[PDB]
Symmetry: C2
Subunit: 62 residues, 2 copies
């Protein structure tokens, strides 16, 4: 799996063996053009106060 | 985990024991900002020919 791991569109890192989920963190209460976070995950992370998480299981899908 | 499981904004199910992801399938191509499939997921589904899938892990996040 390769995931997007910056805010920008062609930098991606190959995910460690545990990790099988790209996530993308997105500012909840105020709309933004670029994500706040992007990386690999083992378990898809729960939403918090500030940030809204969304995951997928496919190369370069975040 | 309660996920939306229908095409409409309210109806949700209690996800069966051991399905701790909600998913939302959208039409991969066009600007239909509304889901073609939602429900509970064991592992987050891969992208398909025509749908793009997307998972999250809090109640009713999909």
């Amino acid at each position: 799996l390769k995931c997007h791991n910056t805010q920008l569109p062609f930098i991606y890192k190959t995910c460690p063996e545990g990790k099988n989920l790209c996530f993308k963190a997105t500012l909840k209460k105020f709309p933004l053009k670029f994500p706040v976070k992007r990386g690999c995950a083992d378990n898809c992370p729960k939403n918090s106060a500030l940030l809204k998480y969304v995951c997928c299981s496919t190369d370069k899908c975040n």
